[PDB]
Design a protein around this motif. Structure first.
Motif, PDB file in Angstrom:
ATOM      1  N   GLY A   9       0.859  -1.161   0.000  1.00 35.84           N
ATOM      2  CA  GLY A   9       0.000   0.000   0.000  1.00 35.84           C
ATOM      3  C   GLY A   9       0.897   1.212   0.000  1.00 35.84           C
ATOM      4  O   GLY A   9       1.827   1.246  -0.797  1.00 35.84           O
ATOM      5  N   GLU A  10       0.639   2.189   0.871  1.00 38.24           N
ATOM      6  CA  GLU A  10       1.400   3.448   0.903  1.00 38.24           C
ATOM      7  C   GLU A  10       1.548   4.050  -0.515  1.00 38.24           C
ATOM      8  O   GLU A  10       2.623   4.499  -0.909  1.00 38.24           O
ATOM      9  CB  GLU A  10       2.769   3.219   1.581  1.00 38.24           C
ATOM     10  CG  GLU A  10       2.713   2.610   2.992  1.00 38.24           C
ATOM     11  CD  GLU A  10       2.195   3.594   4.050  1.00 38.24           C
ATOM     12  OE1 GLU A  10       2.954   4.535   4.379  1.00 38.24           O
ATOM     13  OE2 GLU A  10       1.054   3.380   4.526  1.00 38.24           O
ATOM     14  N   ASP A  11       0.467   3.982  -1.309  1.00 45.64           N
ATOM     15  CA  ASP A  11       0.416   4.430  -2.703  1.00 45.64           C
ATOM     16  C   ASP A  11       1.344   3.607  -3.646  1.00 45.64           C
ATOM     17  O   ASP A  11       1.916   4.151  -4.589  1.00 45.64           O
ATOM     18  CB  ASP A  11       0.592   5.969  -2.752  1.00 45.64           C
ATOM     19  CG  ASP A  11      -0.230   6.694  -1.673  1.00 45.64           C
ATOM     20  OD1 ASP A  11      -1.467   6.487  -1.678  1.00 45.64           O
ATOM     21  OD2 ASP A  11       0.385   7.431  -0.866  1.00 45.64           O
ATOM     22  N   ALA A  12       1.488   2.285  -3.401  1.00 44.60           N
ATOM     23  CA  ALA A  12       2.273   1.325  -4.203  1.00 44.60           C
ATOM     24  C   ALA A  12       1.628   1.075  -5.596  1.00 44.60           C
ATOM     25  O   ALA A  12       0.404   1.009  -5.741  1.00 44.60           O
ATOM     26  CB  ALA A  12       2.608   0.011  -3.394  1.00 44.60           C
ATOM     27  N   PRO A  14       0.628  -0.791  -9.315  1.00 45.85           N
ATOM     28  CA  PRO A  14      -0.356  -1.846  -9.360  1.00 45.85           C
ATOM     29  C   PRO A  14       0.284  -3.180  -9.731  1.00 45.85           C
ATOM     30  O   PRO A  14      -0.060  -4.231  -9.202  1.00 45.85           O
ATOM     31  CB  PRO A  14      -1.420  -1.451 -10.412  1.00 45.85           C
ATOM     32  CG  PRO A  14      -0.737  -0.326 -11.177  1.00 45.85           C
ATOM     33  CD  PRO A  14      -0.001   0.289  -9.997  1.00 45.85           C
ATOM     34  N   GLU A  15       1.250  -3.085 -10.643  1.00 49.89           N
ATOM     35  CA  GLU A  15       2.085  -4.174 -11.107  1.00 49.89           C
ATOM     36  C   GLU A  15       2.958  -4.740  -9.972  1.00 49.89           C
ATOM     37  O   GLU A  15       3.016  -5.955  -9.777  1.00 49.89           O
ATOM     38  CB  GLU A  15       2.953  -3.624 -12.251  1.00 49.89           C
ATOM     39  CG  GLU A  15       3.158  -4.662 -13.359  1.00 49.89           C
ATOM     40  CD  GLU A  15       2.047  -4.670 -14.427  1.00 49.89           C
ATOM     41  OE1 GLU A  15       1.518  -3.582 -14.771  1.00 49.89           O
ATOM     42  OE2 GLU A  15       1.778  -5.781 -14.929  1.00 49.89           O
ATOM     43  N   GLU A  16       3.622  -3.860  -9.206  1.00 50.32           N
ATOM     44  CA  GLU A  16       4.405  -4.232  -8.021  1.00 50.32           C
ATOM     45  C   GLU A  16       3.523  -4.901  -6.976  1.00 50.32           C
ATOM     46  O   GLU A  16       3.875  -5.954  -6.442  1.00 50.32           O
ATOM     47  CB  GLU A  16       5.092  -3.002  -7.393  1.00 50.32           C
ATOM     48  CG  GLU A  16       6.123  -2.343  -8.315  1.00 50.32           C
ATOM     49  CD  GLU A  16       7.169  -3.336  -8.843  1.00 50.32           C
ATOM     50  OE1 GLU A  16       7.459  -4.353  -8.176  1.00 50.32           O
ATOM     51  OE2 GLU A  16       7.575  -3.175 -10.015  1.00 50.32           O
ATOM     52  N   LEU A  17       2.351  -4.304  -6.756  1.00 48.59           N
ATOM     53  CA  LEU A  17       1.266  -4.786  -5.923  1.00 48.59           C
ATOM     54  C   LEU A  17       0.990  -6.278  -6.181  1.00 48.59           C
ATOM     55  O   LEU A  17       1.014  -7.059  -5.231  1.00 48.59           O
ATOM     56  CB  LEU A  17       0.047  -3.851  -6.156  1.00 48.59           C
ATOM     57  CG  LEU A  17      -0.350  -2.963  -4.985  1.00 48.59           C
ATOM     58  CD1 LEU A  17      -0.928  -3.680  -3.776  1.00 48.59           C
ATOM     59  CD2 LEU A  17       0.849  -2.161  -4.550  1.00 48.59           C
ATOM     60  N   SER A  18       0.804  -6.690  -7.444  1.00 48.27           N
ATOM     61  CA  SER A  18       0.599  -8.092  -7.844  1.00 48.27           C
ATOM     62  C   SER A  18       1.722  -9.026  -7.378  1.00 48.27           C
ATOM     63  O   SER A  18       1.460 -10.005  -6.673  1.00 48.27           O
ATOM     64  CB  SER A  18       0.476  -8.210  -9.370  1.00 48.27           C
ATOM     65  OG  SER A  18      -0.532  -7.378  -9.896  1.00 48.27           O
ATOM     66  N   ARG A  19       2.971  -8.745  -7.791  1.00 47.37           N
ATOM     67  CA  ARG A  19       4.151  -9.553  -7.444  1.00 47.37           C
ATOM     68  C   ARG A  19       4.294  -9.666  -5.929  1.00 47.37           C
ATOM     69  O   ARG A  19       4.430 -10.762  -5.392  1.00 47.37           O
ATOM     70  CB  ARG A  19       5.432  -8.943  -8.040  1.00 47.37           C
ATOM     71  CG  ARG A  19       5.438  -8.888  -9.571  1.00 47.37           C
ATOM     72  CD  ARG A  19       6.735  -8.236 -10.088  1.00 47.37           C
ATOM     73  NE  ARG A  19       6.620  -6.768 -10.259  1.00 47.37           N
ATOM     74  CZ  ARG A  19       6.063  -6.165 -11.304  1.00 47.37           C
ATOM     75  NH1 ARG A  19       5.471  -6.846 -12.259  1.00 47.37           N
ATOM     76  NH2 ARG A  19       6.100  -4.865 -11.443  1.00 47.37           N
ATOM     77  N   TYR A  20       4.235  -8.521  -5.250  1.00 39.99           N
ATOM     78  CA  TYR A  20       4.349  -8.419  -3.806  1.00 39.99           C
ATOM     79  C   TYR A  20       3.271  -9.226  -3.068  1.00 39.99           C
ATOM     80  O   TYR A  20       3.584  -9.970  -2.137  1.00 39.99           O
ATOM     81  CB  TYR A  20       4.311  -6.935  -3.432  1.00 39.99           C
ATOM     82  CG  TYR A  20       4.782  -6.734  -2.005  1.00 39.99           C
ATOM     83  CD1 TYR A  20       6.150  -6.554  -1.704  1.00 39.99           C
ATOM     84  CD2 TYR A  20       3.851  -6.805  -0.964  1.00 39.99           C
ATOM     85  CE1 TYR A  20       6.557  -6.327  -0.372  1.00 39.99           C
ATOM     86  CE2 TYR A  20       4.243  -6.559   0.362  1.00 39.99           C
ATOM     87  CZ  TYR A  20       5.592  -6.272   0.660  1.00 39.99           C
ATOM     88  OH  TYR A  20       5.954  -5.943   1.931  1.00 39.99           O
ATOM     89  N   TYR A  21       2.006  -9.115  -3.495  1.00 39.58           N
ATOM     90  CA  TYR A  21       0.896  -9.883  -2.931  1.00 39.58           C
ATOM     91  C   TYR A  21       1.115 -11.394  -3.002  1.00 39.58           C
ATOM     92  O   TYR A  21       0.886 -12.088  -2.010  1.00 39.58           O
ATOM     93  CB  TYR A  21      -0.423  -9.528  -3.635  1.00 39.58           C
ATOM     94  CG  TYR A  21      -1.263  -8.497  -2.913  1.00 39.58           C
ATOM     95  CD1 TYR A  21      -1.582  -8.689  -1.554  1.00 39.58           C
ATOM     96  CD2 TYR A  21      -1.798  -7.399  -3.612  1.00 39.58           C
ATOM     97  CE1 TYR A  21      -2.412  -7.772  -0.886  1.00 39.58           C
ATOM     98  CE2 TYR A  21      -2.668  -6.507  -2.960  1.00 39.58           C
ATOM     99  CZ  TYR A  21      -2.968  -6.686  -1.590  1.00 39.58           C
ATOM    100  OH  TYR A  21      -3.818  -5.837  -0.952  1.00 39.58           O
ATOM    101  N   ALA A  22       1.576 -11.902  -4.151  1.00 38.52           N
ATOM    102  CA  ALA A  22       1.896 -13.318  -4.309  1.00 38.52           C
ATOM    103  C   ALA A  22       2.889 -13.803  -3.233  1.00 38.52           C
ATOM    104  O   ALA A  22       2.690 -14.873  -2.652  1.00 38.52           O
ATOM    105  CB  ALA A  22       2.406 -13.559  -5.734  1.00 38.52           C
TER     106      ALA A  22
END
Length: 36
Positions: A9-12, A14-22
């Motif tokens: 989060g912290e305004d991250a 969307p693409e990074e968001l995907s990889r990071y969530y996995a």
């Protein structure tokens, strides 16, 4: 320490968001190894 990456989060971005969530579920998978 919880030894887990805190949720993004912290305004991250969307693409990074995907990889990071996995990776979140990836570490959590090590905490679920019942005696089969």
């Amino acid at each position: 320490y919880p030894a887990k990456p805190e949720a993004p989060g912290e305004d991250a971005s969307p693409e990074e968001l995907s990889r990071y969530y996995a990776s979140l579920r990836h570490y959590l998978n090590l905490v679920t190894r019942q005696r089969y």
